[PDB]
Amino acid sequence: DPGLQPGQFSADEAGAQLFAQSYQSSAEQVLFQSVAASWAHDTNITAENARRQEEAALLSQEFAEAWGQKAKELYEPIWQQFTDPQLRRIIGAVRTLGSANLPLAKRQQYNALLSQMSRIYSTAKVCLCWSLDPDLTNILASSRSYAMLLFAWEGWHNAAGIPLKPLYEDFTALSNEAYKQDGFTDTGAYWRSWYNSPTFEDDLEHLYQQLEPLYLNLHAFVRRALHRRYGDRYINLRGPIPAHLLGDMWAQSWENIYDMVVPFPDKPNLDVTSTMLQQGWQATHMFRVAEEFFTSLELSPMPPEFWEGSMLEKPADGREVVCHASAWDFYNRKDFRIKQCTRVTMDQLSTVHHEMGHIQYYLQYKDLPVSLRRGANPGFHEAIGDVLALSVSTPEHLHKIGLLDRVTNDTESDINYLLKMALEKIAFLPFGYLVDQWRWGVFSGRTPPSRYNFDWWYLRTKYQGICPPVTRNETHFDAGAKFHVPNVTPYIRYFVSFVLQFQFHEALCKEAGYEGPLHQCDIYRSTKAGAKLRKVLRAGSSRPWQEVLKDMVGLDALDAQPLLKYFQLVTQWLQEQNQQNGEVLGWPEYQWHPPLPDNYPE
Amino acid sequence: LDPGLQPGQFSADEAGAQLFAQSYQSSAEQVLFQSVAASWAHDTNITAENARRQEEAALLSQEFAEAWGQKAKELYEPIWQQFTDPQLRRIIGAVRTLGSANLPLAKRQQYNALLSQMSRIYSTAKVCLTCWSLDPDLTNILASSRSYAMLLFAWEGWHNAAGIPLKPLYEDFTALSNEAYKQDGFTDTGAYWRSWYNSPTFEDDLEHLYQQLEPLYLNLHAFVRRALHRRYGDRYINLRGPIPAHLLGDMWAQSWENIYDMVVPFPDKPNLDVTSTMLQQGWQATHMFRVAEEFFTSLELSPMPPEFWEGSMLEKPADGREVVCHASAWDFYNRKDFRIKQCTRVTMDQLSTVHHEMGHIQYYLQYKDLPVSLRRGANPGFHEAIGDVLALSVSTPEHLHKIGLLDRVTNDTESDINYLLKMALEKIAFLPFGYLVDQWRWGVFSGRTPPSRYNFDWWYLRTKYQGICPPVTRNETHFDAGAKFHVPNVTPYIRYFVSFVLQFQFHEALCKEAGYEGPLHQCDIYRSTKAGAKLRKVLRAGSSRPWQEVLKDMVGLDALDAQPLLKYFQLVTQWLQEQNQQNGEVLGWPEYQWHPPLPDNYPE
Ligand SMILES: *[C@@H]1O[C@H](CO[C@@H]2O[C@@H](C)[C@@H](O)[C@@H](O)[C@@H]2O)[C@@H](O[C@@H]2O[C@H](CO)[C@@H](O[C@@H]3O[C@H](CO)[C@@H](O)[C@H](O)[C@@H]3O)[C@H](O)[C@H]2NC(C)=O)[C@H](O)[C@H]1NC(C)=O
Ligand SMILES: C[C@H](N[C@H](C(=O)O)[C@@H]1CCCN1C(=O)[C@@H](N)CCC(=O)O)C(=O)N1CCC[C@H]1C(=O)O
Ligand SMILES: C[C@H](N[C@H](C(=O)O)[C@@H]1CCCN1C(=O)[C@@H](N)CCC(=O)O)C(=O)N1CCC[C@H]1C(=O)O
Ligand SMILES: *[C@@H]1O[C@H](CO)[C@@H](O[C@@H]2O[C@H](CO)[C@@H](O)[C@H](O)[C@H]2NC(C)=O)[C@H](O)[C@H]1NC(C)=O
Ligand SMILES: *[C@@H]1O[C@H](CO[C@@H]2O[C@@H](C)[C@@H](O)[C@@H](O)[C@@H]2O)[C@@H](O)[C@H](O)[C@H]1NC(C)=O
Ligand SMILES: *[C@@H]1O[C@H](CO)[C@@H](O)[C@H](O)[C@H]1NC(C)=O
Ligand SMILES: *[C@@H]1O[C@H](CO)[C@@H](O)[C@H](O)[C@H]1NC(C)=O
Ligand SMILES: [Cl-]
Ligand SMILES: [Cl-]
Ligand SMILES: [Zn+2]
Ligand SMILES: [Zn+2]
């Protein structure tokens, strides 16, 4: 389109001021038509929807090509030297073309692999048919039968991973070609550029080192409990934990096995799932309850377009959907939606808050020039709803919303709560860190196709201390059985969030005027904490996240002390328990795999 | 420190520096000698009393290094980098690096004790059940047994006996070493070891080299795996998995020359492993070293001096004494004493080792007149390549014929494949191992591999690069890296990777200088005084000039380059790829998790 193709403009700071306004003008329309078509497909997976999606992806590249080439022409000389930092941010972004740098037939091919990988992931079933969500999800969460958990884990990893591998290798090659033309050594380097930090990798590594003792202690304590349940045949007290026994397909959060490891067991059940079902909660209640938390802070309610247009339950009409929960900004300032195959569980209630966190962000920055309508970094975007969920999950808040009868504020209830929170937050950390370590090595060429599974399991064992419960080889592509890999969504943002949410939480609880233990704070109804959060959300990516962070929390860097201080009591406790059972921290028997159950699979 | 050994005063300028280096050189050689001598006494006669003496000599060295080091600092800390004299900058640059001399005395004593105990553990470890030593007993088993159970016994016995007791010492050594070098301004000890190559893209340069060589290795591996499967069967060899690490002829699987007889593609052609002929003919250690020497003199390089023949240890002592058997060359730094210590056995590969060690001696003879600080190879890989280049000529069929080791001469395509395959078992099979060892140790020095992952990371790398797997389960009580000499002995490894590449660049250049005009793999530089003069210019330089410029003068290129090695191997590279295809092989080891079962009723 002519009216989409760029204007003239002079080569100078002024000219560039007009240029950017012209850019963000036509981009609104283009982003709209992409986001719109992926939506049609994600909630209705067909050949046709795929075709449409590809058409839109092409139009985007054409736009990006035209506008990036123009910004090179005009500004490539002089843009790093404009006094205005907000402009410098916008122009640098504009001149990064991405898959737009590809010639046309490769542009095609890349758009198509995304579509087949997405389809394979979200339509894969396990047969003797069970889908990932809800069937395999519920099995992994609540079955305590070694053999059934095994059959779900293997069936899933085989059904999703095997067929994806050939496509993923093609995808990597195209993505790398594309980004090399913007001056990036490879795609991973581009993804990392989003944090604008020279010492990014080193910083993450220093963070992980302070967090590792917490995970090691939690792991040994949980390993001990799984040994009690499953015996020496299947659990090695000095070896990795079999990857299917931790309550989740990816072993990435362990809250579903809380009932097996709860430290003082007879006390009130801090998992309120059975009460939610007892009371008849539905998807709609969960969303309204999340919203009211938002509005209690004087943040924005969800608009009519959100309720009218979102998909809050898996459709009952035999229609393939991408189940994985997600939040959608259509770049209209009007349409914002969530697509979630919502189940009635306490962990889904948290997911609903996580997703609505994204929507709130999008409502707070909708009056920005498109290119500023991102989080200050991707980690910020992932942390917003998680922050509110930390207040929601407190026993006192649960009591306020009628899901729990008031607990006694004693040291045992503290420990039980902190341990549940550790199963969700600390257990996640190694997996949050390792996923993009795998994918950065793939994009760099350090991990060729001939080592995709070898390097995956190296990292899984290294960081999470888990092992595959059945033999794997390079026909298997176990990384491809996690959503974000075929769906090309970066992962390091979740490790950043998991640390960042504790920094935000402590800053918020301070603005709230709260004065007790960090892990007992509820910011519900604090207009002041709301005010501070609002300033973060409206800023989008106009400013450096380092400065956004300082204004918010008083420090200019990611920091583990808030998280450490939140969990201090359970950290101290777990250390004591492991000693008394004389545990080995870590998994020195690193070659150990469990045997197969007798005559598997029958 | 003895008064005559201590630094005086020198002005704070380049003219003071020169007098300083000259005064240092006078005292350094006495201090180097006492230290080398004490190491010799210990290594040829391992006793508590000898280790005590070596420890005291190492402390004296440290006192010397610290006094001359801190003086070199005090007077020249900035200005040394701006010296007009390049050799003087290199000398000062070395003197000002203190290493272990940076530790306070208590820690220096701890470090020196650790080195001594780690050396003693490795060089006195035995496998029991009447005791087998590594050399010759376990070496011979790995080389000639074809009994899966026997090889396993030797492999496991060794790794358990040497590795397990070393692990606590290695951990403490790593920490002290890093603490020492970090006061020289290095992030860790591996950064200091890498600085010897004076190349900011060193790690990337090596990775790029490795990428070009990897296909040759994968094809050699697959072909050998097939040969082992036909002998050991489907239970112990997985045609799509890593090879068990005790079946390749060598304790470390680091070179595969010993399974030549099982892989030779054309058995009707002359037998190129002449070990049996050396035995039939009655060769001893002394003949081996004299034949090596005569190659050097044929090139008009120097003979071994009388002090070499009078002082060297050329067989394992019969008199009942513990010795360090691993072969080594020794410069005493007095310009007079130069020695080899080798438990020589009468085999073709030992004849190659004789040449390797004599190449070291020849370098020390040619540079003996330089300042002590420049008595080193242009980089460490240069010192490792000298003897190997000559051994390339020696191993040729035509050369073996001239020295009475191979009666039949043939020049046809099948004999050439046999020869190039035998050379690939020696040279191409080593590459992955030569590359991986310091990747392991650089990770340990940088803290990426903590003690809790020493064996996990070691086997990750052994599988990744070599495509082998341990034949019994290992865990973190094992310390398999410690079962290789250079780990406990603290000798860096990347130099052998460098030298396996560089020796083909040197070979190509000396062949050309020799006037030789046929296939590169049939060249013998024997009796070429032109080739000798070109080599002599390298040897005479020591570390006085940047290795990149020495290389360029020699070979006409200023970088390591895989092209000469590819050219040498081209006929067998192509043959192995065609054979593996016809046989339907899988290149690589996609069943990465596979390990062989135990023999029924092992080890009874
Ligand atoms: C073993 O045999 C090879 C092959 O020899 C050649 O091909 C055979 C099939 C027969 O036809 C032989 O008669 C024929 O020579 C020998 O390699 C060859 O060596 C010759 C002699 O040095 C090489 O010729 C030289 O080539 C250069 C140019 O590169 C000229 O400047 C010279 O004047 C001269 O002609 C010939 O290139 C070379 N062939 C190959 C494939 O490199 C080989 O020397 C012989 N080896 C032994 C140990 O005897
Ligand atoms: C269910 C949660 N879902 C993701 C998500 O919401 O992050 C979804 C799918 C991938 C991206 N996403 C979005 O919604 C994007 N709109 C967010 C980025 C943006 O808006 O700019 C999740 O994956 N999670 C939750 C935490 C752990 C992680 C996981 O489940 O692996
Ligand atoms: C047997 C050969 N042995 C070494 C050797 O000679 O390199 C000996 C022991 C370690 C260092 N060394 C020396 O003699 C040094 N004095 C030489 C360096 C110098 O003087 O500047 C070796 O290990 N090798 C040979 C190639 C493969 C390697 C190995 O066997 O693992
Ligand atoms: C639960 O008990 C703890 C006592 O251990 C309370 O913590 C104290 O709370 C007061 C009031 O805010 C503060 O002044 C103290 O500094 C707190 N002490 C410590 C050591 O943390 C906590 O507030 C109680 N709250 C609930 C939820 O009942
Ligand atoms: C890879 O694995 C596939 C699945 O088979 C299972 O794993 C093998 C390794 C056995 O140990 C057993 O657990 C199962 O049969 C195999 O079909 C396939 O052949 C393996 N090899 C390759 C190269 O893909
Ligand atoms: C070995 O060393 C001891 C002292 O530790 C010495 O008395 C003995 O003579 C030495 N043996 C030989 C043969 O050098
Ligand atoms: C490692 O293996 C050995 C024997 O194979 C065994 O004794 C030991 O218990 C295992 N070590 C550890 C730390 O578990
Ligand atoms: Cl990210
Ligand atoms: Cl080296
Ligand atoms: Zn999210
Ligand atoms: Zn050597």
PDB file of C-alpha atoms and ligand atoms in Angstrom, chain A residues 250 252 324-329 331 351 354-355 358 362 365 373-375 378 381-382 386 428 431 482-484 487 489 491 493-494 498, ligand 2:
ATOM      1  CA  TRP A 250       8.337 -30.271  32.099  1.00  0.00           C
ATOM      2  CA  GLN A 252       9.139 -26.811  35.731  1.00  0.00           C
ATOM      3  CA  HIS A 324      -1.297 -22.559  25.938  1.00  0.00           C
ATOM      4  CA  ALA A 325      -2.586 -19.455  27.805  1.00  0.00           C
ATOM      5  CA  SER A 326      -1.777 -16.102  26.185  1.00  0.00           C
ATOM      6  CA  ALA A 327      -2.614 -12.375  26.177  1.00  0.00           C
ATOM      7  CA  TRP A 328      -3.119 -10.366  22.967  1.00  0.00           C
ATOM      8  CA  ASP A 329      -2.594  -6.675  22.093  1.00  0.00           C
ATOM      9  CA  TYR A 331      -2.372  -2.402  18.476  1.00  0.00           C
ATOM     10  CA  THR A 351      -2.178 -18.186  35.479  1.00  0.00           C
ATOM     11  CA  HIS A 354      -0.309 -13.704  35.036  1.00  0.00           C
ATOM     12  CA  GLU A 355      -2.276 -13.250  31.787  1.00  0.00           C
ATOM     13  CA  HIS A 358      -0.118  -8.582  30.372  1.00  0.00           C
ATOM     14  CA  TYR A 362      -1.303  -3.109  27.279  1.00  0.00           C
ATOM     15  CA  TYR A 365       0.615   2.004  27.333  1.00  0.00           C
ATOM     16  CA  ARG A 373       4.251  -0.514  23.485  1.00  0.00           C
ATOM     17  CA  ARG A 374       6.420  -3.285  24.869  1.00  0.00           C
ATOM     18  CA  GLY A 375       7.543  -3.826  28.462  1.00  0.00           C
ATOM     19  CA  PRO A 378      10.375  -8.674  28.327  1.00  0.00           C
ATOM     20  CA  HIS A 381       5.974  -7.956  31.071  1.00  0.00           C
ATOM     21  CA  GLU A 382       6.141 -11.435  32.648  1.00  0.00           C
ATOM     22  CA  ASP A 386       2.881 -12.645  39.084  1.00  0.00           C
ATOM     23  CA  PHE A 428      11.149 -23.023  38.320  1.00  0.00           C
ATOM     24  CA  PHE A 431      14.389 -24.457  34.115  1.00  0.00           C
ATOM     25  CA  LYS A 482       7.839 -27.484  25.372  1.00  0.00           C
ATOM     26  CA  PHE A 483       5.474 -24.821  23.855  1.00  0.00           C
ATOM     27  CA  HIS A 484       7.894 -21.896  23.558  1.00  0.00           C
ATOM     28  CA  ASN A 487       6.336 -21.276  19.051  1.00  0.00           C
ATOM     29  CA  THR A 489       8.956 -17.435  22.164  1.00  0.00           C
ATOM     30  CA  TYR A 491      12.350 -17.951  27.630  1.00  0.00           C
ATOM     31  CA  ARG A 493      12.267 -13.399  30.334  1.00  0.00           C
ATOM     32  CA  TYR A 494      10.751 -15.897  32.793  1.00  0.00           C
ATOM     33  CA  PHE A 498      10.962 -14.780  38.747  1.00  0.00           C
TER      34      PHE A 498
HETATM   35  C1  LIG C   2       1.117 -19.408  30.360  1.00  0.00           C
HETATM   36  C2  LIG C   2       2.219 -18.475  29.901  1.00  0.00           C
HETATM   37  N1  LIG C   2       1.921 -18.129  28.475  1.00  0.00           N
HETATM   38  C3  LIG C   2       2.829 -17.152  27.804  1.00  0.00           C
HETATM   39  C4  LIG C   2       2.859 -15.939  28.670  1.00  0.00           C
HETATM   40  O1  LIG C   2       1.795 -15.330  29.059  1.00  0.00           O
HETATM   41  O2  LIG C   2       4.014 -15.627  28.945  1.00  0.00           O
HETATM   42  C5  LIG C   2       2.200 -16.691  26.450  1.00  0.00           C
HETATM   43  C6  LIG C   2       2.592 -17.766  25.298  1.00  0.00           C
HETATM   44  C7  LIG C   2       4.009 -17.250  24.832  1.00  0.00           C
HETATM   45  C8  LIG C   2       3.960 -15.835  24.977  1.00  0.00           C
HETATM   46  N2  LIG C   2       2.611 -15.520  25.889  1.00  0.00           N
HETATM   47  C9  LIG C   2       1.905 -14.159  25.950  1.00  0.00           C
HETATM   48  O3  LIG C   2       0.887 -13.992  26.642  1.00  0.00           O
HETATM   49  C10 LIG C   2       2.546 -12.912  25.223  1.00  0.00           C
HETATM   50  N3  LIG C   2       1.517 -11.994  24.816  1.00  0.00           N
HETATM   51  C11 LIG C   2       3.396 -12.162  26.272  1.00  0.00           C
HETATM   52  C12 LIG C   2       4.465 -11.233  25.667  1.00  0.00           C
HETATM   53  C13 LIG C   2       3.853  -9.859  25.341  1.00  0.00           C
HETATM   54  O4  LIG C   2       2.624  -9.647  25.508  1.00  0.00           O
HETATM   55  O5  LIG C   2       4.577  -8.942  24.902  1.00  0.00           O
HETATM   56  C14 LIG C   2       3.630 -19.142  30.077  1.00  0.00           C
HETATM   57  O6  LIG C   2       4.103 -19.609  29.095  1.00  0.00           O
HETATM   58  N4  LIG C   2       4.385 -19.193  31.393  1.00  0.00           N
HETATM   59  C15 LIG C   2       3.860 -18.578  32.830  1.00  0.00           C
HETATM   60  C16 LIG C   2       5.021 -18.459  33.618  1.00  0.00           C
HETATM   61  C17 LIG C   2       5.932 -19.680  33.207  1.00  0.00           C
HETATM   62  C18 LIG C   2       5.634 -19.804  31.640  1.00  0.00           C
HETATM   63  C19 LIG C   2       5.502 -21.225  31.176  1.00  0.00           C
HETATM   64  O7  LIG C   2       4.423 -21.749  31.380  1.00  0.00           O
HETATM   65  O8  LIG C   2       6.413 -21.921  30.556  1.00  0.00           O
END
